[PDB]
Amino acid sequence: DLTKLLIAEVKSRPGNSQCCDCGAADPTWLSTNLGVLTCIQCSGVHRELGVRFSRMQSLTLDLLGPSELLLALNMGNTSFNEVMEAQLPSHGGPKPSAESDMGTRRDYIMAKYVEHRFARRCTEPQRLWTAICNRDLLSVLEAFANGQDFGQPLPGPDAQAPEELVLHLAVKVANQASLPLVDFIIQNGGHLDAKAADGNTALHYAALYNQPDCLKLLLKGRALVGTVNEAGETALDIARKKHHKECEELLEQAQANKEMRILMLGLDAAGKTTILYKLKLGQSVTTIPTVGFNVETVTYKNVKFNVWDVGGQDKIRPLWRHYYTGTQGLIFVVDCADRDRIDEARQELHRIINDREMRDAIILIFANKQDLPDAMKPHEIQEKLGLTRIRDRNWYVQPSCATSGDGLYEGLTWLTSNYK
Ligand SMILES: Nc1nc2c(ncn2[C@@H]2O[C@H](COP(=O)(O)OP(=O)(O)O)[C@@H](O)[C@H]2O)c(=O)[nH]1
Ligand SMILES: [Mg+2]
Ligand SMILES: [Mg+2]
Ligand SMILES: [Zn+2]
Protein backbone atom coordinates (compact mmCIF):
# COMPACT_ATOMS: atom_id res chain seq x y z
CA ASP A 1 0.00 0.00 0.00
CA LEU A 2 3.07 2.25 0.45
CA THR A 3 3.55 2.14 -3.32
CA LYS A 4 -0.08 2.92 -4.28
CA LEU A 5 0.80 6.57 -3.55
CA LEU A 6 4.09 6.66 -5.43
CA ILE A 7 2.28 5.05 -8.38
CA ALA A 8 -0.27 7.87 -8.28
CA GLU A 9 2.63 10.28 -7.80
CA VAL A 10 4.46 9.04 -10.92
CA LYS A 11 1.29 9.30 -13.02
CA SER A 12 0.70 12.96 -12.07
CA ARG A 13 4.10 14.30 -13.22
CA PRO A 14 4.12 16.79 -16.14
CA GLY A 15 3.28 14.97 -19.41
CA ASN A 16 2.76 11.60 -17.74
CA SER A 17 -0.89 11.63 -18.85
CA GLN A 18 0.22 11.20 -22.46
CA CYS A 19 2.44 8.47 -23.92
CA CYS A 20 6.07 9.60 -24.04
CA ASP A 21 6.28 8.53 -27.68
CA CYS A 22 2.80 8.93 -29.22
CA GLY A 23 0.89 10.97 -26.62
CA ALA A 24 -1.87 8.38 -26.18
CA ALA A 25 -4.48 8.51 -23.39
CA ASP A 26 -2.82 8.12 -19.95
CA PRO A 27 -0.12 5.33 -20.29
CA THR A 28 0.68 2.60 -17.73
CA TRP A 29 4.03 1.26 -18.95
CA LEU A 30 7.21 2.57 -17.34
CA SER A 31 10.75 2.51 -18.71
CA THR A 32 12.28 2.16 -15.26
CA ASN A 33 15.77 3.15 -16.35
CA LEU A 34 14.65 6.37 -18.07
CA GLY A 35 11.79 7.34 -15.77
CA VAL A 36 9.17 7.69 -18.55
CA LEU A 37 5.69 6.36 -19.49
CA THR A 38 4.43 4.77 -22.72
CA CYS A 39 1.13 3.34 -23.99
CA ILE A 40 1.00 -0.44 -24.40
CA GLN A 41 1.51 -0.05 -28.17
CA CYS A 42 4.73 1.98 -28.00
CA SER A 43 5.75 -0.09 -24.96
CA GLY A 44 6.46 -3.16 -27.08
CA VAL A 45 9.03 -1.44 -29.27
CA HIS A 46 11.05 -0.68 -26.11
CA ARG A 47 10.95 -4.37 -25.20
CA GLU A 48 12.34 -4.94 -28.70
CA LEU A 49 15.31 -2.62 -28.10
CA GLY A 50 16.16 -4.71 -25.05
CA VAL A 51 17.11 -4.06 -21.44
CA ARG A 52 20.30 -2.32 -22.61
CA PHE A 53 18.21 0.68 -23.76
CA SER A 54 14.94 0.26 -21.85
CA ARG A 55 13.64 -1.85 -18.94
CA MET A 56 9.83 -1.97 -19.14
CA GLN A 57 7.51 -2.63 -16.22
CA SER A 58 3.75 -2.06 -16.00
CA LEU A 59 2.36 0.20 -13.30
CA THR A 60 -0.87 -1.78 -13.42
CA LEU A 61 0.66 -5.24 -13.83
CA ASP A 62 4.16 -5.45 -12.36
CA LEU A 63 4.96 -5.44 -8.65
CA LEU A 64 7.03 -2.29 -8.16
CA GLY A 65 9.33 -1.42 -5.28
CA PRO A 66 9.81 2.22 -4.21
CA SER A 67 13.44 2.11 -5.36
CA GLU A 68 12.40 1.15 -8.92
CA LEU A 69 10.27 4.28 -9.12
CA LEU A 70 13.06 6.78 -8.42
CA LEU A 71 13.71 8.12 -11.95
CA ALA A 72 10.00 7.81 -12.77
CA LEU A 73 9.28 10.15 -9.86
CA ASN A 74 12.14 12.42 -10.89
CA MET A 75 11.82 12.67 -14.63
CA GLY A 76 8.42 12.27 -16.26
CA ASN A 77 7.61 12.66 -19.95
CA THR A 78 7.81 16.46 -20.37
CA SER A 79 11.18 16.83 -18.66
CA PHE A 80 12.49 13.93 -20.77
CA ASN A 81 11.17 14.90 -24.23
CA GLU A 82 12.37 18.47 -23.74
CA VAL A 83 15.80 16.87 -24.11
CA MET A 84 15.08 13.81 -26.27
CA GLU A 85 12.40 15.29 -28.52
CA ALA A 86 14.02 18.74 -28.34
CA GLN A 87 14.65 19.45 -32.04
CA LEU A 88 11.26 18.20 -33.21
CA PRO A 89 9.01 20.56 -35.22
CA SER A 90 5.40 20.98 -34.03
CA HIS A 91 3.95 20.63 -37.55
CA GLY A 92 4.17 17.28 -39.40
CA GLY A 93 6.70 15.91 -36.87
CA PRO A 94 7.21 12.11 -37.27
CA LYS A 95 5.90 11.59 -33.69
CA PRO A 96 2.88 9.24 -34.06
CA SER A 97 -0.62 9.36 -32.58
CA ALA A 98 -2.60 6.94 -30.38
CA GLU A 99 -3.31 4.70 -33.38
CA SER A 100 -0.62 5.04 -36.03
CA ASP A 101 0.43 1.70 -37.47
CA MET A 102 3.28 -0.29 -35.89
CA GLY A 103 5.26 0.50 -39.05
CA THR A 104 5.52 4.24 -38.37
CA ARG A 105 5.57 3.68 -34.61
CA ARG A 106 8.64 1.42 -34.54
CA ASP A 107 10.72 3.62 -36.88
CA TYR A 108 10.36 6.77 -34.78
CA ILE A 109 11.00 5.14 -31.39
CA MET A 110 14.07 3.31 -32.71
CA ALA A 111 15.46 6.55 -34.16
CA LYS A 112 14.63 8.45 -30.95
CA TYR A 113 16.16 6.24 -28.22
CA VAL A 114 18.84 4.24 -30.03
CA GLU A 115 20.01 6.62 -32.74
CA HIS A 116 19.12 9.83 -30.77
CA ARG A 117 18.10 11.85 -33.87
CA PHE A 118 15.67 14.30 -32.24
CA ALA A 119 17.86 15.30 -29.29
CA ARG A 120 19.39 18.66 -28.33
CA ARG A 121 22.95 18.48 -29.63
CA CYS A 122 26.43 19.51 -28.40
CA THR A 123 29.49 17.22 -27.95
CA GLU A 124 31.55 17.43 -23.48
CA PRO A 125 33.76 16.59 -20.42
CA GLN A 126 33.33 20.02 -18.80
CA ARG A 127 29.53 20.24 -18.34
CA LEU A 128 29.13 16.69 -17.12
CA TRP A 129 31.36 17.25 -14.08
CA THR A 130 29.44 20.50 -13.43
CA ALA A 131 25.95 19.00 -13.92
CA ILE A 132 26.62 16.08 -11.56
CA CYS A 133 27.69 18.26 -8.63
CA ASN A 134 24.94 20.75 -9.48
CA ARG A 135 22.62 17.72 -9.18
CA ASP A 136 21.32 18.66 -12.65
CA LEU A 137 19.64 15.42 -13.77
CA LEU A 138 18.31 16.94 -16.96
CA SER A 139 21.81 17.86 -18.19
CA VAL A 140 23.24 14.44 -17.45
CA LEU A 141 20.46 13.29 -19.77
CA GLU A 142 21.61 15.86 -22.33
CA ALA A 143 25.12 14.34 -22.15
CA PHE A 144 23.72 10.84 -22.60
CA ALA A 145 21.74 12.01 -25.64
CA ASN A 146 24.91 13.05 -27.47
CA GLY A 147 26.61 9.66 -26.93
CA GLN A 148 28.78 10.70 -23.98
CA ASP A 149 29.57 7.16 -22.81
CA PHE A 150 29.91 7.27 -19.03
CA GLY A 151 32.50 4.49 -19.45
CA GLN A 152 35.83 6.30 -19.87
CA PRO A 153 36.74 9.07 -17.35
CA LEU A 154 36.97 12.88 -17.26
CA PRO A 155 39.91 15.21 -16.41
CA GLY A 156 39.15 17.03 -13.13
CA PRO A 157 39.72 20.51 -11.61
CA ASP A 158 42.86 21.84 -9.82
CA ALA A 159 46.05 19.70 -9.63
CA GLN A 160 44.81 17.16 -12.22
CA ALA A 161 47.60 14.55 -11.99
CA PRO A 162 45.24 11.56 -11.30
CA GLU A 163 41.98 10.49 -13.01
CA GLU A 164 38.38 9.75 -11.93
CA LEU A 165 35.38 8.46 -13.90
CA VAL A 166 31.74 9.59 -13.98
CA LEU A 167 30.00 7.17 -11.57
CA HIS A 168 32.88 7.34 -9.08
CA LEU A 169 32.30 11.09 -8.80
CA ALA A 170 28.49 11.10 -8.51
CA VAL A 171 28.80 8.66 -5.59
CA LYS A 172 31.33 10.89 -3.80
CA VAL A 173 29.23 14.10 -4.03
CA ALA A 174 25.72 12.76 -3.40
CA ASN A 175 22.81 13.31 -1.02
CA GLN A 176 19.14 12.24 -0.83
CA ALA A 177 18.34 14.66 -3.68
CA SER A 178 21.40 13.74 -5.76
CA LEU A 179 20.33 10.08 -6.00
CA PRO A 180 18.38 9.92 -9.32
CA LEU A 181 21.58 10.57 -11.37
CA VAL A 182 23.47 7.82 -9.52
CA ASP A 183 20.75 5.39 -10.72
CA PHE A 184 20.39 6.96 -14.16
CA ILE A 185 24.11 6.39 -14.56
CA ILE A 186 24.16 2.83 -13.16
CA GLN A 187 21.29 1.78 -15.39
CA ASN A 188 22.65 3.59 -18.48
CA GLY A 189 26.49 3.66 -18.44
CA GLY A 190 26.93 0.46 -16.44
CA HIS A 191 30.67 0.31 -15.88
CA LEU A 192 29.76 -0.49 -12.30
CA ASP A 193 32.70 -2.79 -11.54
CA ALA A 194 35.46 -0.47 -12.80
CA LYS A 195 38.57 0.04 -10.63
CA ALA A 196 39.85 3.50 -11.71
CA ALA A 197 43.22 4.83 -10.46
CA ASP A 198 43.99 3.18 -7.10
CA GLY A 199 41.92 0.03 -7.78
CA ASN A 200 38.88 1.24 -5.81
CA THR A 201 35.51 0.18 -7.16
CA ALA A 202 32.55 2.56 -7.09
CA LEU A 203 31.45 0.35 -4.18
CA HIS A 204 34.65 1.28 -2.34
CA TYR A 205 34.07 5.06 -2.58
CA ALA A 206 30.54 4.80 -1.13
CA ALA A 207 32.07 3.31 2.04
CA LEU A 208 34.47 6.24 2.40
CA TYR A 209 32.21 9.30 2.24
CA ASN A 210 29.21 8.24 4.38
CA GLN A 211 27.03 7.63 1.31
CA PRO A 212 24.61 4.97 2.59
CA ASP A 213 21.71 5.06 0.13
CA CYS A 214 24.37 5.05 -2.58
CA LEU A 215 25.45 1.58 -1.41
CA LYS A 216 21.81 0.49 -1.53
CA LEU A 217 21.48 1.49 -5.21
CA LEU A 218 24.85 -0.02 -6.14
CA LEU A 219 24.12 -3.56 -4.89
CA LYS A 220 20.57 -3.39 -6.25
CA GLY A 221 22.32 -3.35 -9.63
CA ARG A 222 24.24 -6.59 -8.85
CA ALA A 223 27.62 -5.18 -7.74
CA LEU A 224 30.75 -7.23 -6.99
CA VAL A 225 31.93 -7.24 -3.38
CA GLY A 226 35.35 -7.87 -1.84
CA THR A 227 37.30 -7.11 -5.01
CA VAL A 228 40.63 -5.70 -3.84
CA ASN A 229 42.35 -2.43 -4.75
CA GLU A 230 45.87 -0.97 -4.59
CA ALA A 231 45.69 -1.10 -0.80
CA GLY A 232 44.25 -4.64 -1.14
CA GLU A 233 41.10 -3.71 0.80
CA THR A 234 37.61 -5.20 0.51
CA ALA A 235 34.84 -2.58 0.41
CA LEU A 236 34.20 -3.48 4.07
CA ASP A 237 37.83 -2.80 5.04
CA ILE A 238 37.65 0.92 4.22
CA ALA A 239 34.29 1.11 5.99
CA ARG A 240 36.14 -0.12 9.09
CA LYS A 241 38.92 2.52 9.02
CA LYS A 242 36.48 5.46 9.07
CA HIS A 243 33.99 3.40 11.14
CA HIS A 244 30.90 4.39 9.09
CA LYS A 245 28.66 1.79 10.78
CA GLU A 246 25.54 2.23 8.59
CA CYS A 247 27.54 1.24 5.48
CA GLU A 248 28.98 -1.70 7.43
CA GLU A 249 25.54 -3.19 8.24
CA LEU A 250 24.69 -3.42 4.52
CA LEU A 251 28.11 -4.79 3.53
CA GLU A 252 27.79 -7.71 5.97
CA GLN A 253 24.48 -8.97 4.54
CA ALA A 254 25.84 -8.39 1.02
CA GLN A 255 28.03 -11.49 1.49
CA ALA A 256 25.07 -13.90 1.75
CA ASN A 257 -0.21 -39.02 -34.40
CA LYS A 258 2.00 -37.86 -31.50
CA GLU A 259 0.55 -34.65 -29.97
CA MET A 260 2.24 -32.63 -27.21
CA ARG A 261 0.68 -30.14 -24.80
CA ILE A 262 3.33 -27.49 -24.29
CA LEU A 263 3.41 -24.74 -21.69
CA MET A 264 5.62 -21.75 -22.46
CA LEU A 265 6.61 -19.63 -19.44
CA GLY A 266 9.34 -17.20 -18.34
CA LEU A 267 9.51 -13.58 -17.18
CA ASP A 268 8.04 -10.63 -19.10
CA ALA A 269 9.55 -9.82 -22.52
CA ALA A 270 11.49 -13.11 -22.45
CA GLY A 271 10.44 -13.69 -26.10
CA LYS A 272 7.58 -16.09 -25.47
CA THR A 273 5.16 -14.77 -28.08
CA THR A 274 8.00 -13.91 -30.46
CA ILE A 275 8.94 -17.62 -30.34
CA LEU A 276 5.36 -18.94 -30.60
CA TYR A 277 4.53 -16.81 -33.64
CA LYS A 278 7.82 -17.11 -35.52
CA LEU A 279 7.23 -20.89 -35.39
CA LYS A 280 3.64 -20.54 -36.55
CA LEU A 281 4.34 -17.98 -39.28
CA GLY A 282 8.01 -18.46 -40.18
CA GLN A 283 8.20 -14.67 -40.39
CA SER A 284 9.10 -12.61 -37.31
CA VAL A 285 6.11 -10.64 -36.07
CA THR A 286 6.01 -7.64 -33.76
CA THR A 287 4.73 -8.41 -30.26
CA ILE A 288 2.81 -6.24 -27.83
CA PRO A 289 2.91 -7.40 -24.17
CA THR A 290 0.61 -10.42 -24.04
CA VAL A 291 -1.82 -9.40 -21.27
CA GLY A 292 -3.57 -12.74 -21.05
CA PHE A 293 -2.10 -15.72 -22.84
CA ASN A 294 -1.92 -17.19 -26.33
CA VAL A 295 -2.69 -20.61 -27.81
CA GLU A 296 -1.49 -21.84 -31.18
CA THR A 297 -0.98 -25.31 -32.65
CA VAL A 298 2.33 -25.86 -34.46
CA THR A 299 3.14 -29.06 -36.34
CA TYR A 300 6.82 -29.83 -36.88
CA LYS A 301 7.86 -33.25 -38.20
CA ASN A 302 4.48 -35.01 -37.87
CA VAL A 303 4.08 -33.99 -34.20
CA LYS A 304 1.31 -31.63 -33.00
CA PHE A 305 2.22 -28.99 -30.42
CA ASN A 306 -0.41 -27.38 -28.21
CA VAL A 307 1.48 -24.34 -26.99
CA TRP A 308 0.19 -22.19 -24.15
CA ASP A 309 2.07 -18.86 -24.09
CA VAL A 310 1.31 -17.05 -20.81
CA GLY A 311 2.12 -13.39 -20.05
CA GLY A 312 5.07 -12.86 -17.72
CA GLN A 313 4.19 -9.77 -15.70
CA ASP A 314 4.59 -10.07 -11.91
CA LYS A 315 0.83 -9.94 -11.29
CA ILE A 316 -0.12 -12.48 -13.96
CA ARG A 317 2.30 -15.21 -12.80
CA PRO A 318 0.20 -16.66 -9.95
CA LEU A 319 -2.15 -17.63 -12.78
CA TRP A 320 0.50 -20.09 -13.99
CA ARG A 321 -0.53 -22.91 -11.59
CA HIS A 322 -3.82 -23.30 -13.48
CA TYR A 323 -2.02 -24.31 -16.65
CA TYR A 324 0.01 -27.01 -14.87
CA THR A 325 -2.47 -29.90 -15.26
CA GLY A 326 -2.13 -32.07 -18.38
CA THR A 327 1.26 -30.59 -19.27
CA GLN A 328 3.95 -32.75 -20.87
CA GLY A 329 6.69 -30.34 -21.96
CA LEU A 330 7.74 -27.01 -20.45
CA ILE A 331 9.44 -24.25 -22.42
CA PHE A 332 11.03 -21.69 -20.15
CA VAL A 333 12.20 -18.70 -22.14
CA VAL A 334 15.10 -16.68 -20.71
CA ASP A 335 16.13 -13.22 -21.96
CA CYS A 336 19.88 -13.56 -21.64
CA ALA A 337 20.79 -9.89 -22.04
CA ASP A 338 18.75 -9.32 -18.86
CA ARG A 339 21.64 -10.13 -16.55
CA ASP A 340 19.91 -8.27 -13.69
CA ARG A 341 16.98 -10.67 -13.52
CA ILE A 342 18.51 -14.11 -14.03
CA ASP A 343 18.08 -15.08 -10.36
CA GLU A 344 14.44 -14.08 -10.82
CA ALA A 345 14.18 -16.48 -13.75
CA ARG A 346 15.96 -19.04 -11.55
CA GLN A 347 13.34 -18.60 -8.83
CA GLU A 348 10.26 -18.84 -11.05
CA LEU A 349 11.61 -21.81 -13.03
CA HIS A 350 12.36 -23.62 -9.78
CA ARG A 351 8.96 -22.53 -8.44
CA ILE A 352 7.38 -24.53 -11.31
CA ILE A 353 9.44 -27.72 -11.66
CA ASN A 354 9.04 -28.28 -7.91
CA ASP A 355 5.24 -27.96 -8.02
CA ARG A 356 3.52 -31.26 -7.26
CA GLU A 357 1.50 -30.96 -10.48
CA MET A 358 4.63 -31.11 -12.61
CA ARG A 359 7.09 -33.87 -11.63
CA ASP A 360 6.63 -35.72 -14.96
CA ALA A 361 7.58 -32.75 -17.18
CA ILE A 362 10.14 -32.52 -19.96
CA ILE A 363 11.93 -29.17 -19.64
CA LEU A 364 13.23 -27.21 -22.60
CA ILE A 365 14.91 -23.94 -21.74
CA PHE A 366 15.37 -21.43 -24.49
CA ALA A 367 18.34 -19.21 -23.75
CA ASN A 368 16.82 -16.42 -25.82
CA LYS A 369 18.34 -13.25 -27.34
CA GLN A 370 21.84 -14.55 -28.16
CA ASP A 371 22.22 -11.81 -30.79
CA LEU A 372 22.32 -9.02 -28.21
CA PRO A 373 25.74 -7.48 -27.23
CA ASP A 374 26.60 -8.95 -23.82
CA ALA A 375 24.90 -12.23 -24.42
CA MET A 376 25.32 -14.56 -21.47
CA LYS A 377 26.06 -17.87 -23.17
CA PRO A 378 24.00 -21.07 -22.72
CA HIS A 379 26.46 -22.86 -20.43
CA GLU A 380 26.50 -19.82 -18.13
CA ILE A 381 22.70 -20.12 -18.04
CA GLN A 382 22.86 -23.74 -16.81
CA GLU A 383 25.06 -22.65 -13.91
CA LYS A 384 23.12 -19.50 -12.97
CA LEU A 385 19.77 -21.31 -13.18
CA GLY A 386 21.06 -23.95 -10.73
CA LEU A 387 20.83 -26.83 -13.22
CA THR A 388 24.26 -28.13 -12.17
CA ARG A 389 22.59 -29.81 -9.20
CA ILE A 390 19.45 -31.05 -10.89
CA ARG A 391 19.32 -34.81 -11.22
CA ASP A 392 16.15 -36.89 -11.54
CA ARG A 393 14.76 -34.35 -14.00
CA ASN A 394 15.10 -34.19 -17.78
CA TRP A 395 16.19 -30.76 -19.07
CA TYR A 396 18.06 -29.08 -21.92
CA VAL A 397 19.23 -25.48 -22.44
CA GLN A 398 18.91 -24.34 -26.05
CA PRO A 399 20.56 -21.24 -27.58
CA SER A 400 17.94 -19.21 -29.42
CA CYS A 401 17.34 -16.04 -31.40
CA ALA A 402 13.57 -15.78 -31.92
CA THR A 403 13.95 -12.72 -34.16
CA SER A 404 15.86 -14.78 -36.74
CA GLY A 405 14.65 -18.24 -35.70
CA ASP A 406 18.02 -19.87 -34.93
CA GLY A 407 17.76 -22.68 -32.38
CA LEU A 408 13.96 -22.84 -32.29
CA TYR A 409 13.26 -25.95 -34.36
CA GLU A 410 16.21 -27.63 -32.58
CA GLY A 411 14.37 -27.19 -29.27
CA LEU A 412 11.36 -28.88 -30.79
CA THR A 413 13.64 -31.59 -32.18
CA TRP A 414 14.83 -32.14 -28.63
CA LEU A 415 11.20 -32.22 -27.52
CA THR A 416 10.31 -34.82 -30.17
CA SER A 417 13.29 -36.88 -28.99
CA ASN A 418 12.80 -36.88 -25.21
CA TYR A 419 9.06 -37.61 -25.56
CA LYS A 420 9.39 -41.41 -25.61
N1 LIG B 1 17.40 -9.07 -30.28
C1 LIG B 1 16.43 -9.98 -29.96
N2 LIG B 1 15.18 -9.56 -29.59
C2 LIG B 1 14.21 -10.46 -29.28
C3 LIG B 1 14.51 -11.90 -29.34
N3 LIG B 1 13.39 -12.55 -28.98
C4 LIG B 1 12.44 -11.62 -28.71
N4 LIG B 1 12.94 -10.38 -28.89
C5 LIG B 1 12.22 -9.10 -28.70
O1 LIG B 1 11.90 -8.96 -27.30
C6 LIG B 1 10.64 -8.20 -27.18
C7 LIG B 1 9.79 -9.08 -26.32
O2 LIG B 1 9.29 -10.20 -27.19
P1 LIG B 1 7.95 -11.06 -26.66
O3 LIG B 1 7.56 -12.34 -27.40
O4 LIG B 1 6.79 -10.09 -26.60
O5 LIG B 1 8.43 -11.45 -25.16
P2 LIG B 1 7.28 -12.04 -24.22
O6 LIG B 1 6.30 -11.00 -23.79
O7 LIG B 1 7.79 -12.66 -22.92
O8 LIG B 1 6.52 -13.04 -24.95
C8 LIG B 1 9.98 -8.25 -28.58
O9 LIG B 1 9.84 -6.91 -29.11
C9 LIG B 1 10.90 -9.07 -29.48
O10 LIG B 1 11.07 -8.41 -30.76
C10 LIG B 1 15.88 -12.28 -29.75
O11 LIG B 1 16.20 -13.48 -29.82
N5 LIG B 1 16.76 -11.30 -30.04
MG1 LIG C 1 9.94 -7.05 -10.42
MG1 LIG D 1 4.30 -12.64 -24.25
ZN1 LIG E 1 2.43 5.45 -27.38
From Swiss-Prot:
A zinc finger (C4-type) spans 19-42. Residues 4-128 form the Arf-GAP domain. It comes from the Eukaryota. ANK repeats lie at residues 162-194, 198-227. Transmembrane segments: none annotated. It is found in: Cytoplasm. Highly expressed in primary hepatocarcinoma. Detected in lung, liver and blood leukocytes. Promotes cell proliferation. This is Arf-GAP with SH3 domain, ANK repeat and PH domain-containing protein 3. The chain holds residues 423 to 679 of 903 of the full protein.
